[PDB]
Amino acid sequence: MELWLVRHGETLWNREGRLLGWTDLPLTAEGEAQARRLKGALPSLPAFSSDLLRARRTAELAGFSPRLYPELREIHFGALEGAMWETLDPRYKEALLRFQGFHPPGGESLSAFQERVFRFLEGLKAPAVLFTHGGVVRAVLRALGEDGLVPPGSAVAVDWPRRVLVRLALD
């Protein structure tokens, strides 16, 4: 199934390097600019989006009217919400780097996050554009055997659950 996954535009925490999960931050001026550039670059397909502000706003500025699904939200970092990557305990840094064995207090485990994301993708019956988060795109790319890091406001199209089709970044 052709699916286009879009990483929302940047927020202040991108430059600051803080774990951004369910904390509902707004896009920055540049973030909104990134979203606008996506308009006309994404296919005209049914759209879905994380219900968090930054994702919804990206979808809007990209020219879509998506149906909201919390299942497309970034992982819930719990007590680690807002933590600077830099100061993150080695055990947590490693878990996030290797994308495994991560269960922050008061948050969501990486295994539960993957289950949530993949269950949502499984339910899609036809091609669609998904406005989501870095961790979601990462989970998908990693499951397809590729490096999952993509720039804010960029997109990736995949043939789920078989392969990556294209990565699109705009300047």
Side-chain angles (χ1 to χ4, degrees):
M1 193 68 58
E2 188 178 337
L3 300 179
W4 288 65
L5 291 85
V6 178
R7 178 170 170 192
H8 64 72
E10 56 154 64
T11 67
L12 292 174
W13 283 7
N14 179 68
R15 63 188 65 175
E16 286 187 51
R18 291 177 183 284
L19 290 184
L20 179 59
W22 287 13
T23 293
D24 203 45
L25 294 182
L27 297 170
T28 62
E30 183 51 13
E32 295 204 333
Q34 286 168 337
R36 307 221 183 79
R37 283 196 283 287
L38 288 176
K39 191 171 184 176
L42 299 173
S44 297
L45 294 169
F48 297 92
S49 175
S50 159
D51 62 318
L52 293 172
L53 177 61
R54 53 194 191 274
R56 293 191 286 87
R57 182 59 173 163
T58 293
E60 188 181 338
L61 296 175
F64 294 79
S65 299
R67 183 179 194 185
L68 304 182
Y69 278 92
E71 290 88 345
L72 282 172
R73 283 186 181 196
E74 174 62 86
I75 190 172
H76 180 17
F77 290 111
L80 297 189
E81 289 287 330
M84 225 154 352
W85 172 270
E86 165 192 337
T87 67
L88 208 58
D89 185 301
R91 66 163 167 179
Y92 288 134
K93 282 203 184 76
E94 177 164 74
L96 290 173
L97 288 173
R98 298 180 63 69
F99 215 66
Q100 61 182 189
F102 177 69
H103 204 339
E108 182 172 39
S109 69
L110 258 189
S111 65
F113 171 62
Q114 285 169 317
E115 174 166 26
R116 164 157 77 74
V117 170
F118 303 147
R119 183 181 300 287
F120 176 79
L121 298 185
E122 197 242 75
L124 296 165
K125 310 304 197 317
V129 175
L130 314 177
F131 288 90
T132 185
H133 307 265
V136 174
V137 177
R138 188 177 179 204
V140 170
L141 291 181
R142 270 187 82 86
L144 295 174
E146 307 200 347
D147 184 73
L149 311 179
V150 304
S154 74
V156 299
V158 306
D159 179 12
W160 186 250
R162 297 181 64 74
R163 60 160 289 177
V164 178
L165 298 173
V166 71
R167 299 198 186 208
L168 168 67
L170 303 173
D171 297 0

mmCIF file of all heavy atoms in Angstrom, residues 122-153:
data_model
loop_
_atom_site.group_PDB
_atom_site.id
_atom_site.type_symbol
_atom_site.label_atom_id
_atom_site.label_comp_id
_atom_site.label_asym_id
_atom_site.label_seq_id
_atom_site.Cartn_x
_atom_site.Cartn_y
_atom_site.Cartn_z
ATOM 1 N N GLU A 122 -1.938 -0.930 9.441
ATOM 2 C CA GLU A 122 -2.585 -2.159 8.980
ATOM 3 C C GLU A 122 -4.038 -1.891 8.601
ATOM 4 O O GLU A 122 -4.563 -2.487 7.657
ATOM 5 C CB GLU A 122 -2.515 -3.220 10.085
ATOM 6 C CG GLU A 122 -2.783 -4.653 9.633
ATOM 7 C CD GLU A 122 -3.989 -5.267 10.299
ATOM 8 O OE1 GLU A 122 -5.125 -4.912 9.919
ATOM 9 O OE2 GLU A 122 -3.804 -6.111 11.200
ATOM 10 N N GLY A 123 -4.681 -0.987 9.335
ATOM 11 C CA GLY A 123 -6.073 -0.664 9.067
ATOM 12 C C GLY A 123 -6.346 0.177 7.829
ATOM 13 O O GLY A 123 -7.498 0.299 7.416
ATOM 14 N N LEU A 124 -5.308 0.766 7.238
ATOM 15 C CA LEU A 124 -5.482 1.591 6.044
ATOM 16 C C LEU A 124 -5.759 0.685 4.838
ATOM 17 O O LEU A 124 -4.950 -0.177 4.502
ATOM 18 C CB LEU A 124 -4.230 2.450 5.812
ATOM 19 C CG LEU A 124 -3.951 3.487 6.915
ATOM 20 C CD1 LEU A 124 -2.526 4.017 6.803
ATOM 21 C CD2 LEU A 124 -4.957 4.629 6.805
ATOM 22 N N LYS A 125 -6.901 0.891 4.190
ATOM 23 C CA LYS A 125 -7.296 0.060 3.051
ATOM 24 C C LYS A 125 -6.918 0.610 1.682
ATOM 25 O O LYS A 125 -7.044 -0.093 0.673
ATOM 26 C CB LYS A 125 -8.807 -0.173 3.067
ATOM 27 C CG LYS A 125 -9.375 -0.660 4.385
ATOM 28 C CD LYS A 125 -8.704 -1.930 4.864
ATOM 29 C CE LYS A 125 -9.559 -2.595 5.931
ATOM 30 N NZ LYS A 125 -10.084 -1.591 6.898
ATOM 31 N N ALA A 126 -6.479 1.861 1.637
ATOM 32 C CA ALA A 126 -6.102 2.478 0.372
ATOM 33 C C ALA A 126 -5.033 3.543 0.586
ATOM 34 O O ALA A 126 -4.846 4.032 1.703
ATOM 35 C CB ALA A 126 -7.335 3.094 -0.296
ATOM 36 N N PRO A 127 -4.327 3.925 -0.489
ATOM 37 C CA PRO A 127 -3.273 4.944 -0.411
ATOM 38 C C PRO A 127 -3.726 6.201 0.321
ATOM 39 O O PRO A 127 -4.863 6.662 0.147
ATOM 40 C CB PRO A 127 -2.946 5.207 -1.876
ATOM 41 C CG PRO A 127 -3.081 3.829 -2.470
ATOM 42 C CD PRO A 127 -4.385 3.335 -1.842
ATOM 43 N N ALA A 128 -2.827 6.757 1.128
ATOM 44 C CA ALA A 128 -3.130 7.947 1.913
ATOM 45 C C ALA A 128 -1.873 8.720 2.295
ATOM 46 O O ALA A 128 -0.765 8.196 2.208
ATOM 47 C CB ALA A 128 -3.866 7.535 3.180
ATOM 48 N N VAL A 129 -2.064 9.969 2.718
ATOM 49 C CA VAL A 129 -0.972 10.818 3.174
ATOM 50 C C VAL A 129 -1.174 10.893 4.688
ATOM 51 O O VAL A 129 -2.292 11.145 5.160
ATOM 52 C CB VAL A 129 -1.057 12.236 2.577
ATOM 53 C CG1 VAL A 129 0.030 13.120 3.185
ATOM 54 C CG2 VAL A 129 -0.904 12.175 1.057
ATOM 55 N N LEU A 130 -0.106 10.663 5.442
ATOM 56 C CA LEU A 130 -0.174 10.672 6.898
ATOM 57 C C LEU A 130 0.707 11.763 7.501
ATOM 58 O O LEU A 130 1.932 11.724 7.373
ATOM 59 C CB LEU A 130 0.266 9.309 7.443
ATOM 60 C CG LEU A 130 -0.327 8.079 6.747
ATOM 61 C CD1 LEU A 130 0.247 6.801 7.350
ATOM 62 C CD2 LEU A 130 -1.841 8.100 6.891
ATOM 63 N N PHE A 131 0.086 12.742 8.149
ATOM 64 C CA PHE A 131 0.855 13.809 8.778
ATOM 65 C C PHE A 131 1.178 13.316 10.176
ATOM 66 O O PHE A 131 0.285 13.081 10.994
ATOM 67 C CB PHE A 131 0.045 15.101 8.770
ATOM 68 C CG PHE A 131 -0.059 15.704 7.406
ATOM 69 C CD1 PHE A 131 -1.116 15.366 6.566
ATOM 70 C CD2 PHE A 131 0.949 16.529 6.918
ATOM 71 C CE1 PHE A 131 -1.163 15.835 5.258
ATOM 72 C CE2 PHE A 131 0.910 17.006 5.609
ATOM 73 C CZ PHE A 131 -0.153 16.652 4.779
ATOM 74 N N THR A 132 2.467 13.140 10.440
ATOM 75 C CA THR A 132 2.874 12.574 11.706
ATOM 76 C C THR A 132 4.182 13.109 12.308
ATOM 77 O O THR A 132 4.560 14.260 12.069
ATOM 78 C CB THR A 132 2.888 11.023 11.551
ATOM 79 O OG1 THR A 132 3.164 10.398 12.807
ATOM 80 C CG2 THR A 132 3.909 10.591 10.489
ATOM 81 N N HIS A 133 4.877 12.261 13.062
ATOM 82 C CA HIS A 133 6.082 12.674 13.778
ATOM 83 C C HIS A 133 7.356 11.910 13.443
ATOM 84 O O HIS A 133 7.308 10.814 12.887
ATOM 85 C CB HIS A 133 5.805 12.556 15.272
ATOM 86 C CG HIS A 133 4.573 13.286 15.710
ATOM 87 N ND1 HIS A 133 4.611 14.566 16.223
ATOM 88 C CD2 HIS A 133 3.267 12.938 15.661
ATOM 89 C CE1 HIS A 133 3.377 14.975 16.466
ATOM 90 N NE2 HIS A 133 2.543 14.006 16.134
ATOM 91 N N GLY A 134 8.491 12.499 13.814
ATOM 92 C CA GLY A 134 9.777 11.878 13.541
ATOM 93 C C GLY A 134 9.896 10.441 14.014
ATOM 94 O O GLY A 134 10.420 9.585 13.298
ATOM 95 N N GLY A 135 9.422 10.172 15.224
ATOM 96 C CA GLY A 135 9.493 8.829 15.760
ATOM 97 C C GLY A 135 8.637 7.841 14.993
ATOM 98 O O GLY A 135 8.988 6.668 14.892
ATOM 99 N N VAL A 136 7.510 8.309 14.458
ATOM 100 C CA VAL A 136 6.618 7.438 13.694
ATOM 101 C C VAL A 136 7.288 7.104 12.364
ATOM 102 O O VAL A 136 7.320 5.945 11.945
ATOM 103 C CB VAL A 136 5.255 8.120 13.429
ATOM 104 C CG1 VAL A 136 4.395 7.254 12.508
ATOM 105 C CG2 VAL A 136 4.531 8.353 14.760
ATOM 106 N N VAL A 137 7.821 8.125 11.702
ATOM 107 C CA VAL A 137 8.498 7.906 10.433
ATOM 108 C C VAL A 137 9.679 6.980 10.694
ATOM 109 O O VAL A 137 9.940 6.059 9.922
ATOM 110 C CB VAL A 137 9.012 9.228 9.823
ATOM 111 C CG1 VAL A 137 9.790 8.946 8.537
ATOM 112 C CG2 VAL A 137 7.835 10.154 9.526
ATOM 113 N N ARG A 138 10.377 7.213 11.802
ATOM 114 C CA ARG A 138 11.533 6.391 12.143
ATOM 115 C C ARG A 138 11.153 4.924 12.342
ATOM 116 O O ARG A 138 11.831 4.019 11.845
ATOM 117 C CB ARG A 138 12.201 6.918 13.409
ATOM 118 C CG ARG A 138 13.500 6.218 13.702
ATOM 119 C CD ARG A 138 14.183 6.792 14.915
ATOM 120 N NE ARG A 138 15.417 6.067 15.177
ATOM 121 C CZ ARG A 138 16.001 6.002 16.364
ATOM 122 N NH1 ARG A 138 15.461 6.622 17.407
ATOM 123 N NH2 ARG A 138 17.121 5.311 16.503
ATOM 124 N N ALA A 139 10.069 4.687 13.073
ATOM 125 C CA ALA A 139 9.616 3.328 13.330
ATOM 126 C C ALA A 139 9.333 2.604 12.015
ATOM 127 O O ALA A 139 9.706 1.434 11.841
ATOM 128 C CB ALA A 139 8.353 3.353 14.208
ATOM 129 N N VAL A 140 8.676 3.306 11.094
ATOM 130 C CA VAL A 140 8.328 2.750 9.790
ATOM 131 C C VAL A 140 9.575 2.481 8.945
ATOM 132 O O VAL A 140 9.752 1.375 8.433
ATOM 133 C CB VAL A 140 7.367 3.707 9.033
ATOM 134 C CG1 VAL A 140 7.195 3.272 7.573
ATOM 135 C CG2 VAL A 140 6.014 3.710 9.734
ATOM 136 N N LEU A 141 10.443 3.482 8.812
ATOM 137 C CA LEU A 141 11.662 3.304 8.027
ATOM 138 C C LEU A 141 12.538 2.187 8.589
ATOM 139 O O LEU A 141 13.056 1.358 7.829
ATOM 140 C CB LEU A 141 12.455 4.614 7.959
ATOM 141 C CG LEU A 141 11.792 5.721 7.133
ATOM 142 C CD1 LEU A 141 12.679 6.954 7.109
ATOM 143 C CD2 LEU A 141 11.535 5.220 5.718
ATOM 144 N N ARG A 142 12.700 2.151 9.911
ATOM 145 C CA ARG A 142 13.523 1.122 10.534
ATOM 146 C C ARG A 142 12.946 -0.277 10.305
ATOM 147 O O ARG A 142 13.665 -1.250 10.114
ATOM 148 C CB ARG A 142 13.599 1.414 12.033
ATOM 149 C CG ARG A 142 14.774 2.325 12.389
ATOM 150 C CD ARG A 142 14.951 2.469 13.906
ATOM 151 N NE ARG A 142 15.702 1.332 14.446
ATOM 152 C CZ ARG A 142 17.046 1.414 14.427
ATOM 153 N NH1 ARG A 142 17.638 2.490 13.939
ATOM 154 N NH2 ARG A 142 17.777 0.403 14.907
ATOM 155 N N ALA A 143 11.623 -0.387 10.307
ATOM 156 C CA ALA A 143 10.988 -1.680 10.098
ATOM 157 C C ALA A 143 11.203 -2.136 8.660
ATOM 158 O O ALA A 143 11.169 -3.331 8.369
ATOM 159 C CB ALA A 143 9.503 -1.600 10.412
ATOM 160 N N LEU A 144 11.423 -1.179 7.764
ATOM 161 C CA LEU A 144 11.672 -1.500 6.360
ATOM 162 C C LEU A 144 13.176 -1.616 6.111
ATOM 163 O O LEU A 144 13.635 -1.639 4.965
ATOM 164 C CB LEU A 144 11.042 -0.441 5.449
ATOM 165 C CG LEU A 144 9.503 -0.375 5.513
ATOM 166 C CD1 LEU A 144 9.000 0.800 4.684
ATOM 167 C CD2 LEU A 144 8.890 -1.683 5.006
ATOM 168 N N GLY A 145 13.931 -1.690 7.204
ATOM 169 C CA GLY A 145 15.375 -1.840 7.133
ATOM 170 C C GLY A 145 16.220 -0.649 6.723
ATOM 171 O O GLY A 145 17.337 -0.832 6.234
ATOM 172 N N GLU A 146 15.724 0.569 6.917
ATOM 173 C CA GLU A 146 16.499 1.747 6.537
ATOM 174 C C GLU A 146 16.679 2.727 7.689
ATOM 175 O O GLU A 146 15.989 2.637 8.698
ATOM 176 C CB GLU A 146 15.825 2.467 5.366
ATOM 177 C CG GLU A 146 15.529 1.563 4.182
ATOM 178 C CD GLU A 146 15.329 2.332 2.891
ATOM 179 O OE1 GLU A 146 15.170 3.573 2.945
ATOM 180 O OE2 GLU A 146 15.328 1.690 1.821
ATOM 181 N N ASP A 147 17.623 3.653 7.545
ATOM 182 C CA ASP A 147 17.836 4.656 8.580
ATOM 183 C C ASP A 147 16.551 5.467 8.606
ATOM 184 O O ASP A 147 16.089 5.928 7.563
ATOM 185 C CB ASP A 147 19.002 5.575 8.233
ATOM 186 C CG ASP A 147 19.302 6.557 9.346
ATOM 187 O OD1 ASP A 147 19.853 6.128 10.381
ATOM 188 O OD2 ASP A 147 18.974 7.751 9.193
ATOM 189 N N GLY A 148 15.986 5.656 9.793
ATOM 190 C CA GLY A 148 14.724 6.366 9.898
ATOM 191 C C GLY A 148 14.713 7.860 10.144
ATOM 192 O O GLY A 148 13.644 8.434 10.337
ATOM 193 N N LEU A 149 15.874 8.502 10.127
ATOM 194 C CA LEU A 149 15.929 9.941 10.368
ATOM 195 C C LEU A 149 15.624 10.767 9.112
ATOM 196 O O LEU A 149 16.250 10.577 8.068
ATOM 197 C CB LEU A 149 17.312 10.316 10.909
ATOM 198 C CG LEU A 149 17.792 9.442 12.073
ATOM 199 C CD1 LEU A 149 19.182 9.884 12.509
ATOM 200 C CD2 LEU A 149 16.800 9.533 13.237
ATOM 201 N N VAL A 150 14.644 11.663 9.213
ATOM 202 C CA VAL A 150 14.280 12.539 8.098
ATOM 203 C C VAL A 150 14.105 13.951 8.653
ATOM 204 O O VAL A 150 13.727 14.129 9.811
ATOM 205 C CB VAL A 150 12.966 12.097 7.403
ATOM 206 C CG1 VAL A 150 13.085 10.656 6.930
ATOM 207 C CG2 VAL A 150 11.787 12.258 8.349
ATOM 208 N N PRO A 151 14.384 14.974 7.832
ATOM 209 C CA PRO A 151 14.262 16.378 8.244
ATOM 210 C C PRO A 151 12.834 16.823 8.545
ATOM 211 O O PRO A 151 11.871 16.271 8.008
ATOM 212 C CB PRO A 151 14.825 17.145 7.046
ATOM 213 C CG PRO A 151 15.698 16.146 6.344
ATOM 214 C CD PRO A 151 14.911 14.877 6.462
ATOM 215 N N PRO A 152 12.681 17.828 9.421
ATOM 216 C CA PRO A 152 11.345 18.325 9.755
ATOM 217 C C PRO A 152 10.709 18.867 8.475
ATOM 218 O O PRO A 152 11.391 19.470 7.643
ATOM 219 C CB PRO A 152 11.635 19.434 10.764
ATOM 220 C CG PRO A 152 12.863 18.926 11.464
ATOM 221 C CD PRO A 152 13.698 18.421 10.310
ATOM 222 N N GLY A 153 9.409 18.654 8.315
ATOM 223 C CA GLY A 153 8.729 19.133 7.127
ATOM 224 C C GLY A 153 9.085 18.382 5.856
ATOM 225 O O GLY A 153 8.862 18.885 4.755
#
